[model samples]
Target: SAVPFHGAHQAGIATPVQDRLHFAAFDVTTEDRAAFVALLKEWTAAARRLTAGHAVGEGAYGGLPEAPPDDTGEALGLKPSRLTLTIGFGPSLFTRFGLADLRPEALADLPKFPGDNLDRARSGGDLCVQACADDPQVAVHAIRNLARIGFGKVVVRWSQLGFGKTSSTTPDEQTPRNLLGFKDGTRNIAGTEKDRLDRFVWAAEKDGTPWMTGGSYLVARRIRMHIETWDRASLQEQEDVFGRDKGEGAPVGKAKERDEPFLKAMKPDAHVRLAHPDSNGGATLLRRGYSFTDGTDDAGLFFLAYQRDIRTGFVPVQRNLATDALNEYIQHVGSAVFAVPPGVRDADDWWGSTLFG
Candidate 1:
């Protein structure tokens, strides 16, 4: 089914989690702000068409005989697969295009955490587009067209392809599992939680940027799990690390996955106990993470979480994880954050129009 391209808040953030992801971060190459703005308009139009399962511009064929087609043609026969393309602006973007003063206070740079082993090449970007769809080809096609459209205006900084969703917003379905073989996101925020969505996920105008009132903030991280070691550990040892049963994912001393955790009953440094909102001063995040397996040595969770503000959402919660037992088997390799603007209101609206206008 085709998800509407226009809405008050962007799709993909709180929408049912997709099975595949093609997330790309780009660096703007042009010095002209107007030219960059023009590129954004073109990208938005192409995104709308792609999400609807329509060929971009003249499409893969039937164009001027002499020139190449607008779309790359790989996804020509594919359905929409509920495709959604979401755009975001990074802090570095504001440093250029004379937008420094317009930058929001909540979009500040994330401070270094205790277990960070970041890769410089993938750590930052000027802009990012998160393309999610049930079909891998559909997701890839969206990013390919956008990158092609912004040829001279922007360049791909880094990108990650993910499969096997690790988190979900629709709790009615079965919970997904991460690389560690444990059910994840048991307490995730649901798409139907209107009050919680507004208060903890969606940004308000008072958040320091009127243009981002209906939007949300995103944190993307590439974490590499030491799978060999984790797989070799005994079942009892594995459950102790996560503070949950391996089969049912029930919390320590609890019977079901959704049962309230008794944090003190679990190991002091257990991942679940340390990551709970209760332990982090009520800071919560709307997670849409995925598991990625690049090779035998590189396989782990591609962590993606959205929040109203990073300071209270991810930063504080992560800081509290300094002593997490899970830290021993995982390392953060790539990291980036972006200020996702509100969705396009109608056909006349385009990405970034609010901020640029």
Candidate 2:
């Protein structure tokens, strides 16, 4: 499910923070994993203690740290190799919520894409805790701590690629670029003021759950990128496929970065034809994507999209990308579909316990 743009409107005063770390695999035999859980609980308690009243933000998937002891592992029927945490930081943390420090250095060197402007105001970093023997417990502790510290939301996930598969030569080494080398999502849902408002604020009652009437849907996709192969292709070949430049994401037939591309104006024979549109011929889904590079053997796009309608948003584009030229440069390695409920109404909500329990 996609999160509504304004879901955290009041909390938007703080910038979002993210971290991804690799933890050694959990050993079931070590005191039947109770020791690990105890350690994790301690860690979470520490984070809460540290971040106490800092306007913290947090969310999670798969399982909750506060769930009853019996809900761990197979008891909850969850994937052992996965964990996630997300948090938001408030204005007190910096000048204007530390907006100046939020930019990723890697993004500065890359070509400017159409949708890059909307993200300019925010700064974030991802830390992957991989192969940690007690990832489940550690992730719960980490996410809770982040929330207490002022992060509006935090995500912790166990990567199937692990840490060994990423490397320096990995294509799209930066967070914004994709494995194909072209700036993916340039024309994503953030081009104009209207688009930004729609992408971040529109509410769709049709997709909400009983308790999620004001909430949005979250759509995530694990796109494995083929960096080596993409870098070898000719510029023209790449442009013809994505209808954008390899360096600046300039429109295929245009010379300027900010100039409206022919595709946006619907020029004949333009790349607009490739855009994933809804059944009624309207563009849908706001794509806020990031590239993860762990090793050359395993690097790809951690594609995350949000929308009011799943049938009209992510699923259609995914289906369309299946036959797009970029398809050859990547594969759908890992996939997940989650319904992100609205933010907690109060600090004592206990994260997902109401919905799942």
Candidate 3:
């Protein structure tokens, strides 16, 4: 089944968590404002068709006798797999194309946290497309085709393939575990919970960015897990680090996973306690993270989160994590922030139309 493409806010954020992800960050190579805008329109058309399980222009085989086919052909027989393509513009995108004055306050650069070891190539981008679906091939096809369509105007800066979603918007489903083998995002915001979404996730005019009224801010981090070190630690140490039972994922001194955590019962430096909204002045984020393994030596979590404002959401929570015991097993290596604008309102609308118009 296909997730509806037109909406007030983008999919892939609150949409039921998908099992596979193919996320690509692109660098805009064109200097022309009109050219960049044109690309967005083209991309939107292709994304609409792809998400609907249709070909780009025509079916790959019958498209042309000489020229390259519009559709890439790999996903010919594949189901839509509930694919969703969400686009966002990075902070540096405003540098040229007469968009300097349009950058939103909520899109401010993320501060270098206490233990960041960021690699330059994997970090920033001018634009990003988050493709998610139940099948890996469907997700991969979406990114590959979009990248092909933007060939000269945009180049892929960095991309990551992820499996095993670490969070869920549908709280009724079982929470998935991360590479660290701990249930993640147990307190995630539910997609149907409108009040919490408005209060914490959706951007509004009061945020000093009128164009971003229905939009949100996204923070992407590629965090590597110290697998060997974590494995060597004692079971008690592991439980102490997260302050949750390894088997049940229940909070310390609690009987069930959904039971409210008693902050006092958890170690002061435990991950859950430090990262909780109550400990960060009520700061909260809607997380859509995934676990990824790049061979035995390189495996980690690709953390994706959305919020109304970074200054109030990811920034403060990450700072508080400076003292987290879980920090010993993870390192932040890649980072990027994007201002994800409101969704395509109708067939006439394209991505970024709200800002560029």
Candidate 4:
């Protein structure tokens, strides 16, 4: 029999209004999967009713918006457009991998934070929701209802990880980290904290929308990885590609893991070329990522990132490392793009209205 599909949040959301209940579940057999799509449609309608006054701008799933007419009687496809939604299971399901076991009592015994603690747990299980439609609003409603049901403690934001044109890109060019460990994403944006915020933060005043101003950020990524192959590589080789020691994330050709790496001043040796700067320039991408291992079969980074622009942020670096040594050990199997909504000071307002509106 075909395995049922499931979904869950890759990260947590910062919201003021906490749901009294959390988590959601749905069931679909192989024969019913096709017919059950209508359920998603119904779910979406219900979501609209639940959050009637909170509607925001709508996002497209698999195509670009209609092109705008130009003075030359031409319609240009300049609007942001790409394929959304790339789903995959973790190692626990695919390989014989198993996570550290936790009983219900252990779950109850776990330490809790003052605020919603769901986000604090380093590793949470993945949940898949079989909805009636692909509309994100519908997904949001389903997730919200799950929260109301107490499936978990919190409902992280609903986001679509893009795969098409964006998946072909890398994460090393705009930030200082990568899958293998070396400094990634270093050269794209100015390497200052102020610049980082300005480049990535969505400014509200620019839009003249009072309710939306001062809101910042929507981030999502579909990160598929190959753990078996990565495990087979030598520790030294892994460190070389990552530019940091495996155990400590320290710089290579150096003793301390936390210290800065020599790549900033190193010559273009063969190893450095593949792992460090390119002949054209250095790479960059801000990587606030995490390691996710489900048993042993499906283990890898649930690669997540946030940047001012996708093209400049994640795409360029991915393209530069088309032939990086790490490529063999990782596969770009799934992806999606989400306009992360801005945060609200209070929970009474709708989330993501700034972008959706």
lDDT of each: 0.91, 0.38, 0.92, 0.33
Which scores better on lDDT, 1 or 3? 3
Cα RMSD, each candidate: 1.0, 15.4, 0.9, 20.0
Q: Which has the better TM-score: candidate 2, or candidate 4?
A: 2
**What residue runs in model 3 are displaced by over 4 Å at the alpha carbon?**
none
lDDT of 2 by residue, 73-100 (tens): 2212222222333221111211222233
Q: Compared with the true structure, what per-residue lDDT tens digits does model 4 show for residues 237-274?
A: 67655455655444556675435566654323323344
Candidate 3 matches the true fold with a TM-score of 0.98
Model 1: CA > 4 A from native: none
Report the CA-based lDDT of candidate 3 relative to the real structure: 0.92
Model 2 alpha-carbon drift over 4 Å, by segment: 1-157, 160-175, 190-208, 264-272, 276-280, 353-357
Q: Show where candidate 4 strays beyond 4 Å.
A: 1-195, 201-221, 264-284, 294-297, 355-357
Model 2 TM-score relative to the real fold: 0.52
lDDT of 3 by residue, 154-259 (tens): 9999999998799889887898998878888789899999999999999988889888988999999999999999999998999999989988899999999889
Highest lDDT model number: 3
**Candidate 1 vs. truth: CA RMSD?**
1.0
TM-scores for all candidates: the values are: 0.98, 0.52, 0.98, 0.44
Q: What is the overall TM-score of model 4 with all chains considered together?
A: 0.44
